[PDB]
Design a protein around this ligand. Structure first.
Ligand SMILES: Nc1ncnc2c1ncn2[C@@H]1O[C@H](COP(=O)(O)OP(=O)(O)NP(=O)(O)O)[C@@H](O)[C@H]1O
Ligand SMILES: [Ca+2]
Ligand SMILES: [Ca+2]
Ligand SMILES: [Mg+2]
Lengths: 152, 363
């Protein structure tokens, strides 16, 4: 099986990138994101990307999933911005929340031109990079309800 | 406004509503007609009349080969199972990678022109499974009834040059079990008898961690044998067939194929990817589909991939318990997101552009 006349012949193209960049323009949460050095945090709430108030950054509900955008100046230019995007998956988050966090992490990457480097951060397995964002982490019991309807 | 999610497997339709945690309709992708040569029956009702019907699958190896019967399956899914009017529901369909472009062109044409859906999208099955696992990077082994695919994905983008495909999956394993059971003295030949063998396979087969040792164990005593009650009440005994059947996934020569086994196709797919991302793929091998349900398969994949990979490489096989439905669940999640729905083909766009639009919108 080869690629040329197949349903993957348009993968990896500029067209794919253009379509996904346009889709990312339709998420209000990204408007104004990544405009200055710092950490921005959203939580998945019934499939929606919901900002976390600044005063609660660094506290994470174990039942929930989050997107954490770290904007910083790269070594190559002190006046430009680069990005690490971490998605944090609580030990008790549900499948809809983790899957939405993953998809929306890609979307935020798209919105920022592909520049963010993605990091999957499962509770208990957080990278040194993620730990360093909170010089600490506070884990809270509970979380918001799943967006899934349960099929009996 | 609720979107429909339909994962048209070669063997099973999984269908339901976006936002649900599981498909509400799961039934065989079959059309049955009288074995002696309404006029036809679909899905569970064809299964209900298996005694008098010959069963035909309109999808072979992930590709629709009987469009008239496929339309019957879709009509049945909408009107008889889900009991919805399809013109009222945006519809997400699925497809395996490396299919010929005409397959999704005709899928799009029939959805709009026959079923009058308001909008639709065709998604790559393995990508849906990766998102269902909560990942943007990993390599999916998606093995159903028709195709086994290796799909490496990095930061949400499948790497098309490294995607690999093998037309060996559950249907071939069922056929092989029918053959080797016939060689034990239990004749299974008809399309009806095949479905009994498929049940034996799902209930009793497993992947041995060391195949040669397991053959020796089976020949030395009956400690691995299992009894199985037939519909007529007769009790048969199966032995080494329990693990010889799925061993074919690792040794395709069992069915006369010279292809690499699933451990080797996985390794070969990782090796087609840039060196520095292989580490993330090795640690995130995600199993998807019914043919990855055999007990022992994750442990065997871990062993076999460890033997092929660098000695310093962290290897991990992820086996979601729900993986018979991972594709569908990933679709339910993505179809619940407004930005993903923004990418779907509308009826007005189809009316303007025709089937070619599917390649410009669905990635
Ligand atoms: N527990 C099990 N052990 C082994 N095989 C199983 C088990 N459960 C289901 N299967 C097989 O898995 C296949 C159906 O899996 P499924 O993932 O629904 O395939 P599909 O999506 O219909 N086909 P495809 O077009 O290749 O993706 C059949 O061959 C089943 O016999
Ligand atoms: Ca939650
Ligand atoms: Ca990126
Ligand atoms: Mg499938």
């Amino acid at each position: 099986y080869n690629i040329a006349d197949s349903n993957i012949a348009n993968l990896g193209t500029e067209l794919e990138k253009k379509v996904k960049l346009e889709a990312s323009q339709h998420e209000d949460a990204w408007k104004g994101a990544g405009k200055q050095v710092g950490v921005e945090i959203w939580r998945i709430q019934q499939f929606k990307v919901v900002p976390v108030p600044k005063k609660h950054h660094g506290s994470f509900y174990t039942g929930d999933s989050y997107i954490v955008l770290s904007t910083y100046h790269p070594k190559t230019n002190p006046d430009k911005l680069a990005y690490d995007v971490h998605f944090w998956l609580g030990a008790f988050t549900t499948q809809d929340e983790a899957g939405t966090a993953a998809y929306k992490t890609v979307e935020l990457d798209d919105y920022l031109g592909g520049l963010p480097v993605q990091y999957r951060e499962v509770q208990g397995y957080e990278s040194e990079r993620f730990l360093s964002l909170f010089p600490g982490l506070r884990i809270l019991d509970g979380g918001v309800e799943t967006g899934f309807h349960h099929v009996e | 406004t609720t979107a429909l999610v339909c994962d048209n497997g070669s063997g099973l339709v999984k269908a339901g509503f976006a936002g649900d945690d599981a498909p509400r309709a799961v039934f065989p992708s079959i059309v049955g007609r009288p074995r002696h040569q309404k006029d036809s029956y679909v899905g569970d009702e064809a299964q209900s009349k298996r005694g008098i019907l010959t069963l035909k699958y309109p999808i072979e190896h992930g590709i629709i080969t009987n469009w008239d019967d496929m339309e019957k399956i879709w009509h049945h899914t909408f009107y008889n199972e889900l009991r919805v009017a399809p013109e009222e529901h945006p519809t997400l369909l699925t497809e395996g990678p490396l299919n010929p472009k005409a397959n999704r062109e005709k899928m799009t044409q029939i959805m709009f022109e026959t079923f009058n859906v308001p909008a639709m999208y065709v998604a790559i099955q393995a990508v849906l499974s990766l998102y269902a696992s909560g990942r943007t990077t990993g390599i999916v082994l998606d093995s159903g009834d028709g195709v086994t695919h290796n799909v490496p994905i990095y930061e949400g983008y499948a790497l098309p040059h490294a995607i690999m495909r093998l037309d060996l999956a559950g249907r071939d394993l069922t056929d092989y079990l029918m053959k080797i059971l016939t060689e034990r003295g239990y004749s299974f030949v008809t399309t009806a008898e095949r479905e009994i063998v498929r049940d034996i396979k799902e209930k009793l087969c497993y992947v041995a961690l060391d195949f040669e040792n397991e053959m020796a164990t089976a020949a030395s005593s009956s400690s691995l044998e299992k009894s199985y009650e037939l519909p007529d009440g007769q009790v048969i005994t199966i032995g080494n067939e329990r693990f010889r059947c799925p061993e074919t996934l690792f040794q395709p020569s069992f069915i006369g194929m010279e292809s690499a086994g699933i451990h080797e196709t996985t390794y070969n797919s990782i090796m087609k990817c840039d060196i520095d991302i292989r580490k993330d793929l090795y640690a995130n091998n995600v199993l998807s589909g019914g043919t990855t349900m055999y007990p022992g398969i994750a442990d065997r994949m871990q062993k076999e991939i460890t033997a092929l990979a660098p000695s310093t490489m962290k290897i991990k096989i992820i086996a979601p318990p729900e993986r018979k439905y991972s594709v569908w669940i990933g679709g339910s999640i993505l179809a619940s997101l407004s930005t993903f729905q923004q990418m779907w083909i509308s009826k007005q766009e189809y009316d303007e552009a025709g089937p070619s639009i599917v390649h410009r919108k669905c990635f």
